[PDB]
Design a protein around this nucleic acid. Structure first.
Lengths: 10, 10
DNA sequence: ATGCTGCAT
DNA sequence: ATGCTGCAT
């Protein structure tokens, strides 16, 4: 995710 | 992937 | 160290 | 049934 907690996605 | 064999990703 | 996701062939 | 992506905090 994010980053943090990529995207989603990428 | 693709689809097929989405993306990656999505 | 954590933390989601999407279908054509 | 079978493919895989990506970093700030």
């Amino acid at each position: 995710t994010x980053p943090g907690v990529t995207x989603p996605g990428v």
